[PDB]
Write a protein that binds this ligand. Sequence first.
Ligand SMILES: COc1ccc(/C=C2/C(=O)Nc3ccccc3C(=O)N2C)cc1
Ligand SMILES: COc1ccc(/C=C2/C(=O)Nc3ccccc3C(=O)N2C)cc1
Ligand SMILES: [Br-]
Ligand SMILES: [Br-]
Ligand SMILES: [Br-]
Ligand SMILES: [Br-]
Ligand SMILES: [K+]
Ligand SMILES: [K+]
Ligand code: NI
Ligand code: NI
Lengths: 288, 288
Amino acid sequence: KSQIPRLSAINDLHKIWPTVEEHGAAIIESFLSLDIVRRLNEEVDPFVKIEPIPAAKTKDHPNHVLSTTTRLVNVLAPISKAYREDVLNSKVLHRICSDAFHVYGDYWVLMGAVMELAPSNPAQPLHRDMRFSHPIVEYLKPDAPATSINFLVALSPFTAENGATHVILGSHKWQNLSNVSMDATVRALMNPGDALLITDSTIHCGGAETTGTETRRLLTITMGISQLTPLESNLAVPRPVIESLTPLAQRLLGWASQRSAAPRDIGLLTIRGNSIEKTMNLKAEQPL
Amino acid sequence: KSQIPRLSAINDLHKIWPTVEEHGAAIIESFLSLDIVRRLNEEVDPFVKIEPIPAAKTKDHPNHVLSTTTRLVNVLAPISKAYREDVLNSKVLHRICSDAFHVYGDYWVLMGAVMELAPSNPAQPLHRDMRFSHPIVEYLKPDAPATSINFLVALSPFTAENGATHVILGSHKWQNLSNVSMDATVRALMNPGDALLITDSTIHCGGAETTGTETRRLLTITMGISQLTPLESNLAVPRPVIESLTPLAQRLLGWASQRSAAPRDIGLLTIRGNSIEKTMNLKAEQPL
Ligand SMILES: COc1ccc(/C=C2/C(=O)Nc3ccccc3C(=O)N2C)cc1
Ligand SMILES: COc1ccc(/C=C2/C(=O)Nc3ccccc3C(=O)N2C)cc1
Ligand SMILES: [Br-]
Ligand SMILES: [Br-]
Ligand SMILES: [Br-]
Ligand SMILES: [Br-]
Ligand SMILES: [K+]
Ligand SMILES: [K+]
Ligand code: NI
Ligand code: NI
């Protein structure tokens, strides 16, 4: 059976989205440089260690889906300089998203999260993303263009034995889900910095960690149209850190108004005909 | 032909949404009391007078759709005590919205706006709302439950001669739009405080002002699922005014996390498993 298409971020940039549109998945080799991976890991390290279980009884919005040993850290902008500067302004990411979401309009981050999977983590059941947060997406027409996509960026090696992601190629076009089986999957073997790109309709799952020793880490960036509400909020991110960002990064974090692709678009998150950034006089690229 | 169903807010509360679901429109008599209408008008009065044309070249997000003589004022919470307290906590509104959006989950305000139509304002073309801001909604399946609804509340008399709203009953179920004609419409004749409730699929239009003397005013409250992005932002609303609101009102204005109806919902606008209100220690019902 056919393996997941592997593409260069440097040379095959224009081919990435068309490949995902056709096959439902693609591996972007060296999506992030090893330098960026190093700084990202270093910066988020302590936050994953202090992170409680997904469904901790202390939590207001517990995640009852993730395995108890998994640790997920989101709202990365205040944590990571590498995230807020390098990945939020990624030329590759923005070309792909604009290719993907041009029919709808502006896009933003629905969630940027670092996930660390513990040794012996079981495989996730095969699934499509967004079904625990956006019931609306299930009511979209079969041939509706994807309203969100997910960059699954390896922050440590993804191998068959340590639970590399499974995908079913072509499953993003499936309506009948009777052929859903692990038999139909292929793996996303990836070095740190490589990214598996899927859509919200791609049937997939995290793999089983079978060594009992290896800890697998990833950065999952769900990019979606600005008409859909993010899973995470940046409302509590201090103004100085927000004002250190680029205007593009500010928009991605919901600290700007947004536009649809409607010919006479009237906009989203506006204030009496004016933008958030104009109204609040929000500065950009201010060193903190 | 059949007139728009008229229902009591006091006695027919449970009948309102089922009526709209069947017919695409209903008039809620005395949705707001004359007291509330009086205070709302008094409070927004100066803001509509200073409001520039919809597509003013000074604006960041000009509205090129509205007639040039129309004035629209949104982000009403900081303007109006009556809006932020009485209408945002309306028992009738919240019963209707929970009836309407239970399949999806939480709902919030997509836009609360006062609109003043000038004398001799032409009729709007027949349309469905949301097509200039949320292209996504057009891609929803025909029988998908409505993801937004619009309360068109009369703040002055709605008459046939001064441009009362037109609706086509049953048009919310239409797929073929060849029978779209003013021939098929009925009017929403309303006293101040009455509300015309429609869905995002109800074909309708503002009527022609034919007297050349009367100024018509309305409060349009588009309520929609929390999975859809609002047309307006409350990000710049001062913290003291936000903290004077009820928790329910805070949620409606995007100053709280939100929940979907998914059995193991993971939430919207959360912060590492905790809500906005918990994280920021947001107070409620603090007199200012
Ligand atoms: C144990 O098996 C699983 C675990 C997760 C999902 C799916 C999701 C999801 O739809 N959204 C995302 C997106 C990024 C990161 C996490 C999540 C997440 O939390 N869940 C629940 C399915 C099955
Ligand atoms: C001149 O004819 C028109 C004027 C408006 C619309 C429709 C909308 C709309 O879809 N959303 C709303 C919702 C509330 C209040 C205003 C608006 C609005 O601004 N437009 C553009 C159509 C036709
Ligand atoms: Br997991
Ligand atoms: Br994974
Ligand atoms: Br108008
Ligand atoms: Br109207
Ligand atoms: K699942
Ligand atoms: K129109
Ligand atoms: Ni997944
Ligand atoms: Ni309308």
